[PDB]
Amino acid sequence: SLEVSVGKATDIYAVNGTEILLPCTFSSCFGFEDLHFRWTYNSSDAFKILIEGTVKNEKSDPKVTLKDDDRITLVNNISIVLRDLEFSDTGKYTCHVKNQHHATIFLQVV
Amino acid sequence: SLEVSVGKATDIYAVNGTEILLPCTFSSCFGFEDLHFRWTYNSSDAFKILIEGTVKNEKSDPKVTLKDDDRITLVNNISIVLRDLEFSDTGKYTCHVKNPLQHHATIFLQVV
């Protein structure tokens, strides 16, 4: 039918020592098969693949195929949660989705 | 045709004296005709209708039918921009959308 969004980019502030949800959801008018997704971290001096996986189809959950660290977990929802935040976690978190698309979260740990 | 989103709620910080975009977009699978939208402000002690309008259908631009103040403008996309921000502009900005069942997106704005 119809759904609303605050867009594809957001700044999030979060306190050191806690946990934060980094949101990304996607919608499919059509029927998708074998979706590919990847979360990356970027700072001026650093790059990391945080987590990646696939989504077989609209009915099935996302399967995680690779994960950098167990401080990260996955929660159509491909949001991630970053546990036990540190000040070095500040930077840019991007969710890339194939089958071409990306959402961007700027995380500031305070 | 696929589309991603960071969701339906966000916190926004903005500097007094400047302008801020309060985002809300919507997507149509089936389609729509004569959609109704309304933006409200809420604080613990206050309520306002900021702007109201309709979108004739998926091809047409949004049509504004009522606006509280010219500090607000509309910028499919039914985002609004709030100009000449004041500290009292802090609060909850909600975008309500109706398709005849209702949907809404919520911005928490803190002016700093």
Author numbering:
A (entry chain B): 30 to 104, 112 to 135, 142 to 152
B (entry chain A): 30 to 104, 112 to 136, 141 to 152
Question: Paper's wording?
Answer:
Voltage-gated sodium channels are transmembrane proteins responsible for the generation of action potentials in excitable cells and play important roles in the propagation of electrical impulses throughout nerves. They are complexes of a pore-forming α subunit and auxiliary β subunits, designated β1/β1B–β4 (encoded by SCN1B–4B). In addition to the channel modulation, the β subunits function as cell adhesion molecules. In this study, we determined the crystal structures of the mouse and human β4ex proteins containing all three Cys residues, which revealed the formation of a dimer in a parallel arrangement, mediated by the intermolecular disulfide bond and the exchange of the N-terminal segments.
In this study, the human β4ex containing all of the Cys residues was prepared, and its crystal structure was determined in the hexagonal form at 2.2-Å resolution. The human β4ex also assumes the same parallel arrangement as those in the previous and present mouse β4ex crystals. Therefore, it appears that the parallel arrangement of β4 is a conserved natural property. The anti-parallel arrangement was not observed in the cubic and hexagonal crystal forms, probably because PEG fragments were bound to the trans homophilic interface (hexagonal form) and because detergent was used for the crystallization and the C-terminal tag sequence was present (cubic form) (see “Experimental Procedures”). The parallel arrangement of the β4 molecules was mediated, in common, through two types of interactions. First, the β4ex structure forms the intermolecular disulfide bond (the S–S interaction) between the “unpaired” Cys residue (Cys58) in the loop connecting strands B and C. Second, the N-terminal segment Ser30-Val35, which is deleted in another structure of β4ex, is involved in an intermolecular interaction between the two β4ex molecules in the parallel arrangement. This type of interaction is designated hereafter as the N–N interaction. Moreover, in this N–N interaction, the N-terminal segments form hydrogen bonds between their Glu32 and Ser34 with Ser56 and Thr54, respectively, and join the β sheets of the counterparts. As these intermolecular interactions are sophisticated and conserved in the human and mouse β4 structures, we hereafter designate the two β4ex molecules in the parallel arrangement as the parallel dimer.
